[PDB]
């Protein structure tokens, strides 16, 4: 099955599950998402505030956590276990 007039159809370049419908939403739903997700578009810009915002948000709740929230900030609550040879 080789054609020499359509090179994509004879090699497997098929949109197997694609659709050519232009739109199925309405204008009210579409204008809401592009307004809110307009500052999240650029890859270089989005990678900057996700690293800087992600480093702050793990250091905040890592430090403001309580004893019941995380056991490493609870500390010891009993007498320490003495090892052998008096150590």
């Amino acid at each position: 099955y080789f054609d020499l007039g359509e090179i994509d159809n004879t090699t497997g370049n098929w949109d197997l599950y694609g659709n050519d419908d232009p739109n199925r939403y309405n204008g009210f739903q579409n204008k809401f998402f592009e307004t809110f997700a307009g500052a999240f578009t650029k890859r270089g810009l989005l990678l900057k505030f996700l690293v800087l915002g992600g480093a702050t948000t793990i250091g905040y709740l890592g430090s403001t956590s309580s004893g019941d929230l995380l056991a490493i900030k609870n500390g010891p609550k009993q007498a320490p276990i003495m090892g052998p040879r008096g150590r």
Partner: peptide, 8 residues
């Protein structure tokens, strides 16, 4: 860690 691991 749970509390046994912090206490141990």
């Amino acid at each position: 860690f749970g509390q046994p691991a912090v206490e141990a």
